[PDB]
Amino acid sequence: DVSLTPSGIKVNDEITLLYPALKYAEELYLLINQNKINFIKSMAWPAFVNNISDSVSFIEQSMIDNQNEKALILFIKYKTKIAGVVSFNIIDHANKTAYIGYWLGANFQGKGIVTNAINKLIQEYGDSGVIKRFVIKCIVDNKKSNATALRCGFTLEGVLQKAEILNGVSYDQNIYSKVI
Ligand SMILES: CC(=O)SCCNC(=O)CCNC(=O)[C@H](O)C(C)(C)COP(=O)(O)OP(=O)(O)OC[C@H]1O[C@@H](n2cnc3c(N)ncnc32)[C@H](O)[C@@H]1OP(=O)(O)O
Ligand SMILES: Nc1ncnc2c1ncn2[C@@H]1O[C@H](COP(=O)(O)O)[C@@H](O)[C@H]1O
């Protein structure tokens, strides 16, 4: 499979999902910083990304988790730029289940980049038999994340009451799945 390269997973001519490396710390930090105000509305970690050292630490932890297959953290490259992150935030090997997360900088939204990335990951891990069940959980009022889950052919399984906390407030999540 020529799409599986040493540097990452080639989605299409414009998108590669890069394995994390320290060389990406600066670009990743700057991207988060540019998007911090908007990102804080939907995620709980951007509020605390205050220096490049925070991105370095994130990369270091991501590399450890990737090595040990606790997670699969990938940096989305669109054309020449890091565009965001797509991940299996949790890999449950015993139950062949992966829980998916994602974000894109504002300048990278509206281009199908995450939908294309997720479809590629599900092909690679799902059609190979590594993962049987893919899961997306997202806050009920997160319009774009819900739309992405549906665009990727996931099915709504239910609502998880008060399951995600942002800034001390618990929000309901939709839970979606795609089963191979
Ligand atoms: C499970 C979780 O991680 S929950 C937390 C999710 N993350 C966040 O909330 C962080 C903040 N938000 C974001 O980063 C973004 O809004 C995201 C990642 C959730 C969604 O980004 P999008 O760019 O909408 O992702 P996606 O890859 O699905 O693209 C769909 C959009 O691209 C358009 N599009 C353009 N080209 C294509 C294409 N080739 N294929 C598919 N869609 C395309 C679609 O029409 C749609 O645009 P619209 O919203 O105007 O209808
Ligand atoms: N400190 C961080 N820097 C960059 N991306 C992150 C960080 N923490 C989480 N993410 C990613 O954010 C996405 C959404 O996760 P969550 O915030 O849990 O909804 C996932 O792709 C995570 O890997």
Q: What is the 3D shape?
A: globular
Q: How many individual helices?
A: 4
Count every beta strand, where a strand is a DSSP E run of 2 or more residues: 9
N-to-C series of helices and strands? EEEHHEEEHEHEE
- Give Rg in angstroms: 16 Å
**CATH fold-level assignment:** Aminopeptidase
Main sheet specs: 9 strands, mixed
Percent helix: 25-40%
Which secondary-structure class do the elements indicate? alpha+beta
Distance between the termini: 20 Å
Strand content: 35-45%
Strand order, sheet with most strands: 1-2-3-4-5-6-7-9-8
Return the CATH architecture: 3-Layer(aba) Sandwich
Present as ligands are: acetyl coenzyme *A, adenosine monophosphate
CATH homologous superfamily annotation = Gcn5-related N-acetyltransferase (GNAT)
The CATH class is: Alpha Beta
Concise overview:
The chain is an alpha+beta fold. It has helices spanning 25-39, 52-67, 113-126, 143-151, and strands spanning 4-5, 8-10, 15-18, 72-78, 81-92, 97-104, 133-139, 155-166, 169-179.
